[PDB]
Write a protein that binds this ligand. Sequence first.
Ligand SMILES: Cc1cc2nc3c(=O)[nH]c(=O)nc-3n(C[C@H](O)[C@H](O)[C@H](O)COP(=O)(O)OP(=O)(O)OC[C@H]3O[C@@H](n4cnc5c(N)ncnc54)[C@H](O)[C@@H]3O)c2cc1C
Ligand SMILES: Cc1cc2nc3c(=O)[nH]c(=O)nc-3n(C[C@H](O)[C@H](O)[C@H](O)COP(=O)(O)OP(=O)(O)OC[C@H]3O[C@@H](n4cnc5c(N)ncnc54)[C@H](O)[C@@H]3O)c2cc1C
Ligand SMILES: [Cl-]
Lengths: 291, 291
Amino acid sequence: MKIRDLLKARRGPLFSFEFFPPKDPEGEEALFRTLEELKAFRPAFVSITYGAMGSTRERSVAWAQRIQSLGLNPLAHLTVAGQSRKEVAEVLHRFVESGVENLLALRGDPPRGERVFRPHPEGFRYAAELVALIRERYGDRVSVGGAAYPEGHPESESLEADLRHFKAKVEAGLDFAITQLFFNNAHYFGFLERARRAGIGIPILPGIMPVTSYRQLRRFTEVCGASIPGPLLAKLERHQDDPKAVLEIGVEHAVRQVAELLEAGVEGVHFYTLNKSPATRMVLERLGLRP
Amino acid sequence: MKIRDLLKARRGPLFSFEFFPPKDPEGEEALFRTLEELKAFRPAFVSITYGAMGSTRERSVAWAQRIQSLGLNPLAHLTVAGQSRKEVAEVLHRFVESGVENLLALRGDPPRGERVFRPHPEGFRYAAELVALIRERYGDRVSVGGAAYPEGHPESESLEADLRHFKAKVEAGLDFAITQLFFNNAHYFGFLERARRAGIGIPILPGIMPVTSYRQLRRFTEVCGASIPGPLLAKLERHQDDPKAVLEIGVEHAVRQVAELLEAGVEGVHFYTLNKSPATRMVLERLGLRP
Ligand SMILES: Cc1cc2nc3c(=O)[nH]c(=O)nc-3n(C[C@H](O)[C@H](O)[C@H](O)COP(=O)(O)OP(=O)(O)OC[C@H]3O[C@@H](n4cnc5c(N)ncnc54)[C@H](O)[C@@H]3O)c2cc1C
Ligand SMILES: Cc1cc2nc3c(=O)[nH]c(=O)nc-3n(C[C@H](O)[C@H](O)[C@H](O)COP(=O)(O)OP(=O)(O)OC[C@H]3O[C@@H](n4cnc5c(N)ncnc54)[C@H](O)[C@@H]3O)c2cc1C
Ligand SMILES: [Cl-]
């Protein structure tokens, strides 16, 4: 089921989960359990993450298929970094032909260290280019999506620039967008108004991550340039050594974030689960989104 | 000399500094040193903080007359916390008979560690009430600013309510607003849009604090509810013990910030100094201003 159509016909908002393809049998088993626990909430879509450089190629496809057989609806991430144009098309073809209908077109970061983006000698440079390619080969047979950044991409010269670019990418052929994570809703509302004023009208879904680790939260935000509210930061720091206390703080945080997000009429919420179920499960249950 | 008038007639952006009244001789001659250093930057106004719960009002009156007399242009802070209305009026009147033409009508906070605000038995409850009072007794003989919160006042139950209440605070009689500190310009641009969309057309000035102390940053943001970008936080974290590295970090960040703000044409920037001069000096100079 195309997400363009899922969004149009919405009786209500769409809740989606994000997962990454496990590196080892353990993780594979942790994911199987996670999907079981979560498929109960009846998500509109389910994302399968993609290793930049295309290292995890056959995993991402396998799991795209693993979710299909659970009767859920997959969203295939696809990046352009470290890959030829053929190589990017080949795996797109591999998705479509696995029956996948929904694609997040992403560029991907540069590797560890390495501060600037240099493409493959025959690869793409921007996500807008993969979106363009998708529409050119598949038109509307697939629903394409992209990344938005409420607090701006950490590489961008300005916020002016970051948004003009977001717009170019939408004009390339996006049907929706999902945001990078954010912990205070002003950041989303902020961006949404600024986008709509730029005459960008596609559905823009907030991405939410329920905090489960002080160390991870710090390390994640350092990479993607998101900011942690000072009260949350201190709360977490005071309790960082007690994993079940942290889980409760991250949940209470998400619950109250998501509750206003719903009250404000967002089209849906995309959940960064990190392949675990307790946090997202608890958030949804407290919101009354009843199994 | 009224900020309302200075804003209409502004040659370039209005730079301004915030100060608090010191507790002992040591911090007083420290503030005169800082006033001596920063005043060559020809600021449009200089603001002095208030107030223990009025407990330190003699000090703010003393400094408001002291900055007037240096031929700098005073913006006198006034809270309603822990005082009856009559009391709040008397002090207001001591400012205005001093020659002060500019007032920042504020509420003040509860004691550290209490969540709910509890007014004085015979006191005001909202900054707005102070605005109204000032306008009742002094019409437009003075100019009145109030605070704006780009990431929302912590006490506010929704971001739609915080704005709704800010606008009411504007319609009470505001000429300008100054924002609480932010470390990513998205917070501010986002807020500006939302406010115009709500039809608040007054000048809203970004308030910037160049980070000089890691623990200090961590304590203030916990209280005030602002967020710290991931990259900055890990940067500071790395170098927290070397004060002059941290100073270097806070400066390159605030420069990056103020530069873009100026290039987008804000009417001015308001600088949280902590009564120290180097950080703000360094930002203005790197920005190409001459002492
Ligand atoms: C929901 C979501 C899912 C993600 N999934 C993955 C994943 O599965 N695998 C993975 O590796 N990463 C993933 N990422 C991370 C993403 O790959 C990185 O943030 C990457 O750095 C940017 O991706 P992008 O598609 O937004 O890049 P782009 O949209 O191409 O932007 C790249 C940079 O160039 C700028 N730009 C755009 N167009 C132009 C132009 N024409 N001229 C000059 N500059 C331009 C943009 O401002 C930006 O700074 C995800 C991110 C999000 C938000
Ligand atoms: C630029 C700036 C300068 C500052 N200077 C000082 C200072 O000198 N001394 C000091 O102690 N503190 C100072 N502060 C801190 C400030 O006092 C605290 O943040 C205070 O808690 C906020 O009060 P306020 O004046 O902004 O607004 P308030 O109007 O007093 O807001 C308080 C709460 O009530 C809500 N509210 C407003 N009106 C209504 C209503 N009609 N009905 C229901 N709810 C309502 C608001 O959303 C908010 O959550 C300053 C803050 C800023 C941003
Ligand atoms: Cl000194």
